[PDB]
């Protein structure tokens, strides 16, 4: 969240792992940039 712009970068990769964050390297591509202009100090993820 930089100078009112909210910047999202992301990646997807296929895996076969049971209960850990996979050991390896790959970079995230810049996905979208959103001009939202609002203080963010906290966040909360939404589960199904």
């Amino acid at each position: 969240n930089i100078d009112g712009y909210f910047k999202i970068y992301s990646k997807h990769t296929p895996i076969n792992l049971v209960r850990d964050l996979p050991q390896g390297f790959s970079a995230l591509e810049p996905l979208v940039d959103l001009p939202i202009g609002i203080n963010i100090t906290r966040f909360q993820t939404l589960l199904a």
């Binding site: 100078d3 009112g4 712009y5 001009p35 202009g37 609002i38 203080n39």
Partner: protein, 49 residues
């Protein structure tokens, strides 16, 4: 814009933020209408000293 925006009693439909705890960041926007504390006392409800 005086010929568009001005009105004889005053076009009071244009508002600015007079108070803020701290100065806002580049391209930040704040839509809170909440009461500012200038005193050392806490303040609650619609108004106070």
């Amino acid at each position: 814009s005086n010929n568009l925006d001005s009105k004889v009693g005053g076009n009071y439909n244009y508002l600015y933020r007079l108070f803020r705890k701290s100065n806002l960041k580049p391209f930040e926007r704040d839509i809170s209408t909440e009461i500012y504390q200038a005193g050392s006392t806490p303040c609650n409800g619609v108004e106070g000293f």
